[PDB]
Design a protein around this ligand. Sequence first.
Ligand SMILES: *[C@@H]1O[C@H](CO)[C@@H](O)[C@H](O)[C@H]1NC(C)=O
Lengths: 48, 48
Amino acid sequence: EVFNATRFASVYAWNRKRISNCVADYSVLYNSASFSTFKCYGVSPTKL
Amino acid sequence: SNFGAISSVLNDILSRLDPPEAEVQIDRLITGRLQSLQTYVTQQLIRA
Ligand SMILES: *[C@@H]1O[C@H](CO)[C@@H](O)[C@H](O)[C@H]1NC(C)=O
């Protein structure tokens, strides 16, 4: 609902969505248009 | 204490970063803690 959302807000005012109260959906991110870059500053990607 | 490293928890530096960086940080932990011992130890000797 964030990644695949059709129309994002612009960089100046960006829509903040809390991902919360759930179980990690990170496994489904594999097969898709995916990402120009996937860069994890907060943890290594395996710990996600 | 951070001792300049990004955190004072040993593992939380690890799982955040890929180890070749942790080797750098864990210095500032070890260099800090190892010192803090030699401070404490050298105290005890004098106090002893
Ligand atoms: C986003 O859409 C792609 C298909 O275009 C899909 O493969 C991917 O799993 C979707 N992302 C999420 C988080 O569901």
